[PDB]
Each structure stands twice: as C-alpha cells, then as structure tokens.
C-alpha cells in the first residue's frame, strides 16, 4: 500500500475532510490517501443500490434491468424520482422509492440473509425500507472496494447474469479514451455529510478501482458538485483520461 500524501491538496481545496483509494489491477499498485479513514465505518447511502440490485435480481423481484415500478404518487423533492421508473433508471438517477420497493419485496429475513452470507459492513437492518440511510447499516471505504472488487470479477455468490447485469447499469461514462462506472452515495450522520463514489475507470480494456468518502459539516456544501470534481481532479492527477492506462 502506498500512502498519497500529495492528494490532500483536493481535499483542502474544498475544506473537506475525504480518502480516496485506487487500486490498479494492471500495475497492481494500491495508493491510498487517508489510511484511517479508509477502515473506519460509515452509513452507505446510495452506494447500497448496488447490493440492492444484486440480491433484487437474484431473489427474481426485479426481473431484469428494465422491470418498472410505478410512481408511488408522493411527490418528492427530487423531480426525476416521481415518474414511473425501470431498475436502470432509477439506479442511474439514485430513485430511492423504487429501491424502497425492492427492499420491501424482498423481505427482511432474505435480506438479513444475503447481509450475513457476503458479509457487508456491520450487517445491521433497523427498517427495511431505511436501514441503508439511517445509520444502522455502516461499511468502510475499504469494505466496499473489496466488494466492487468481487463484483467486477465475479466473485459474489450470485449468479453470473446478476452480477452483468448491474455493472451494465453502472456505466456511466463512455469515451474512446476511457470508460466509468460508478454509484454516487449521499447520506447524513448527525451534523455531518457523507459523500460516496464508488466504482471503477477501464482504460484499454484494465479496469482501476476506487472509493472515494468525503464529509463536511457545511449545510451549504454542494456535495454533488463537489464529489465530482474531486473524482475528476484526483483521477487526472493519477494520469487517467487519457486513454494510456
């Protein structure tokens, strides 16, 4: 593991307190900025969708990545949430409600059971329906990198065909030069928000995995705004986007 230290300009730059990790499979190097806090435990957000869906689609609640589960008729503060929404959209988007949904099909014994089999975080339901974004559930930085690490690779107890399906869904980004694929996370902790991207960039065809975990005490941070141009400053520092990794 190499330790980063030059990476804090990023995080500095927005007054954040953040880590990032970035594991090239290729070269096989591992830096990592923030080695504490990349084992220390948080709420997952968003970032959980991906757990979601895997065990969605295995179970069969969501039969494949265009099932539709209609608008609730509760009219959210998110625009694109209230809208008939497929398993694609509403990933792409973070739609809470439709994974909500999901949750609840699937019921909390099975769910309890898919969190015990692959291990994830402290495996901890409060609600089924909340237990993502209320605390209750926490997973560290480095917990979820070795999970999308296990999911590019196939290495989940789930079924090939699961395991497609949600990297497809997964991509965000594609150009000549590289491919990216991610989930955004935002969730709160007290006084504190937690900011979440996790995924991998593909560059002729070797993927680089990362996590990246900030937070701010500052209500009126852009934290959507401000994960992104993080990702993107310490990706292009890292030598990405150029189509040479």
Same mark, same amino acid.
């Not at 500095?12 to 970035?22: I, Q, R």
């Not at 969605?56 to 099932?67: A, H, P, R, Y």
């Not at 960039?201 to 992104?228: A, C, Q, W, Y």
């Given at each position: ?5 030059? !990476? ?18 290729? @070269?096989?190097?591992?830096? &990592? ?5 990349? @084992?220390?435990? +948080?709420?997952?957000?968003? =970032? ?22 209609? !608008? ?6 998110? #625009? ?28 909390? #014994?099975?769910? @309890? ?6 291990? +994830? ?26 999970? &999308? ?16 399906? &949600?990297?497809? &869904? ?13 989930? =955004? ?5 007290? #006084? ?7 995924? !991998? ?5 070797? #993927? ?32 990405? +986007?150029?189509?040479?990794?």
């Amino acid at each position: 593991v190499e330790n980063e230290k030059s !990476w804090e300009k990023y995080f500095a730059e927005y007054k954040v307190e953040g880590c990032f990790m970035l594991f090239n499979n290729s @070269q096989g190097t591992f830096k &990592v900025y923030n080695l504490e806090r990349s @084992q220390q435990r +948080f709420l997952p957000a968003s =970032t959980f969708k991906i757990f979601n869906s895997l065990v969605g689609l295995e179970t069969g609640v969501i039969k494949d990545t265009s099932f539709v589960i209609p !608008w609730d008729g509760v009219t959210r503060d998110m #625009p694109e949430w209230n809208h008939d929404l497929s398993m694609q959209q509403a990933f792409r988007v973070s739609a809470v409600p439709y994974f909500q949904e999901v949750a609840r099909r699937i019921t909390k #014994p099975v769910m @309890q059971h898919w969190l015990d089999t692959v291990k +994830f975080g402290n495996m901890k339901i409060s609600k089924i329906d909340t237990f993502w974004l209320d605390n209750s559930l926490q997973i560290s930085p480095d917990e979820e990198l070795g999970f &999308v690490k296990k999911l590019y690779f196939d290495q989940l107890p789930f079924h090939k065909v699961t395991m497609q399906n &949600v990297r497809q &869904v997964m991509l965000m980004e594609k150009k000549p030069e590289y491919e990216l694929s991610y989930k =955004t996370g935002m969730g709160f902790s007290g #006084p504190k928000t937690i900011g979440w991207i996790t995924g !991998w960039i593909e560059e002729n065809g070797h #993927p680089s995995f990362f996590v990246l975990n900030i937070e701010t005490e500052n209500k009126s941070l852009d934290m959507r705004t401000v994960r992104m141009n993080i990702l993107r400053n310490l990706l292009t520092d890292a030598g990405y +986007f150029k189509g040479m990794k």
